[PDB]
C-alpha cells in the first residue's frame, strides 16, 4: 500500500525538512567511527511516504494517548536511522525494528540530532559500513534516514551520559547530561506511536 512521492527542491516542505536535517548535525564522542566524518550532507532526494493504513494505525493510537494525557499527544518530528528502512516504510514500525541493547531498554529509538540517527543507517555502531565499500565513513554510497511523526504522550525523563513503557508513561526521553551539545533521544515501545513520514536520501560530505 505504500507509495513514495518525490518532493521538488523548490517546495517549501523539501526545504524545511532539509534544514532540520542540516542544522541538527553535531560532533559525536566516537570522532566519527560509527557514522563517518562530516559537518553536512548532500541531500539527493526527499520523498513523502503515503500509506493510508499505516496513517490510520498511527492516528488511532495518537488519539488513545492524547485522551490519557489531557488531550495532548506530545507529537514530535524526529529522525530514525535503521538497516530496516525499506521494511519500515512498507509495513510500519513494529517489535522487529527495536534496538534490543539500547540504554533505555528494548524499544524503538529516535533522535533530534540527524547525525545520531546516521550512526545506525548501516547497523548498530555503523556495522561494517556501506555494503559496497565496507566503509562507515563512505562519501560515495547513498544513505537513507526517516524523518518521523512520533507520539510521546507522557514521557519518562531519564537523565543520562520489545520492553514496556515505564508504568504511567507512553515513552522515555533520554536527556543529555554530559555532552553539553547533544540533543535528546527518545524511545517508544509500540510501533503504532510513529509514522515514517519522510524518506531522505543523502550522502555525508567530506569536510574541505
Ligand atoms: O535512529 C536510531 N536508530 C537506532 C537503531 C535502529 C535500528 C537498529 Cl537495528 C538499531 C538501532 C538507535 C538509535 C539510538 F539508539 C538513539 C537515537 C537514534 C537511533
Ligand atoms: Zn560505499
From Swiss-Prot:
Known post-translational modifications?
A: Ubiquitinated at 'Lys-48' and 'Lys-63' by RNF146 when auto-poly-ADP-ribosylated; this leads to degradation. Deubiquitinated by USP25; leading to stabilization.
Query: Which tissues carry this protein?
Result: Highly expressed in placenta, skeletal muscle, liver, brain, kidney, heart, thymus, spinal cord, lung, peripheral blood leukocytes, pancreas, lymph nodes, spleen, prostate, testis, ovary, small intestine, colon, mammary gland, breast and breast carcinoma, and in common-type meningioma. Highly expressed in fetal liver, heart and brain.
User: Out of the domains of life, which is the source?
Assistant: Eukaryota
Can you give the residue ranges of the PARP catalytic domain? 8-208
Provide the protein's localization: Cytoplasm; Golgi apparatus membrane; Nucleus; Chromosome, Telomere
Family recorded in the similarity comment: Belongs to the ARTD/PARP family.
Q: How is the subunit organization of this protein annotated in UniProt?
A: Oligomerizes and associates with TNKS. Interacts with the cytoplasmic domain of LNPEP/Otase in SLC2A4/GLUT4-vesicles. Binds to the N-terminus of Grb14 and TRF1 with its ankyrin repeat region. Interacts with HIF1AN. Interacts with RNF146; this interaction leads to ubiquitination and proteasomal degradation. Interacts with NUMA1.
Annotated function: Poly-ADP-ribosyltransferase involved in various processes such as Wnt signaling pathway, telomere length and vesicle trafficking. Acts as an activator of the Wnt signaling pathway by mediating poly-ADP-ribosylation of AXIN1 and AXIN2, 2 key components of the beta-catenin destruction complex: poly-ADP-ribosylated target proteins are recognized by RNF146, which mediates their ubiquitination and subsequent degradation. Also mediates poly-ADP-ribosylation of BLZF1 and CASC3, followed by recruitment of RNF146 and subsequent ubiquitination.
* Descriptive protein name: Poly [ADP-ribose] polymerase tankyrase-2
Q: Which organism is it from?
A: Homo sapiens (Human)
The gene name on file is TNKS2
The full protein's residues present here are 952 to 1161 of 1166
Amino acid at each position: 500500500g505504500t507509495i513514495l512521492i518525490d518532493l521538488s527542491p523548490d517546495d517549501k516542505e523539501f526545504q524545511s525538512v532539509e534544514e532540520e536535517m542540516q542544522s541538527t548535525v553535531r560532533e559525536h564522542r566516537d570522532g566519527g567511527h560509527a557514522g563517518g566524518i562530516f559537518n553536512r550532507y548532500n541531500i539527493l532526494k526527499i520523498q513523502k511516504v503515503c500509506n493510508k493504513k499505516l496513517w490510520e494505525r498511527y492516528t488511532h493510537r495518537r488519539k488513545e494517548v492524547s485522551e490519557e494525557n489531557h488531550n495532548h499527544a506530545n507529537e514530535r518530528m524526529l529522525f530514525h536511522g535503521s538497516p530496516f528502512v525499506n521494511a519500515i516504510i512498507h509495513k510500519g514500525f513494529d517489535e522487529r525494528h527495536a534496538y534490543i541493547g539500547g540504554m533505555f531498554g528494548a524499544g524503538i529509538y529516535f533522535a533530534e540530532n540527524s547525525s545520531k540517527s546516521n550512526q545506525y543507517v548501516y547497523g548498530i555502531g555503523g556495522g561494517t559500513g556501506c555494503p559496497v565499500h565496507k566503509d562507515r565513513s563512505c562519501y560515495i554510497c547513498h544513505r537513507q534516514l526517516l524523518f518521523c511523526r512520533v507520539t510521546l504522550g507522557k514521557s519518562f525523563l531519564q537523565f543520562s551520559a520489545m520492553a514496556h513503557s515505564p508504568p504511567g508513561h507512553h515513552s522515555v526521553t533520554g536527556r543529555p547530561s554530559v555532552n553539553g551539545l547533544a540533543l535528546a533521544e527518545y524511545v517508544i515501545y509500540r510501533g503504532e506511536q510513529a509514522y515514517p513520514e519522510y524518506l531522505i536520501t543523502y550522502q555525508i560530505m567530506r569536510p574541505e
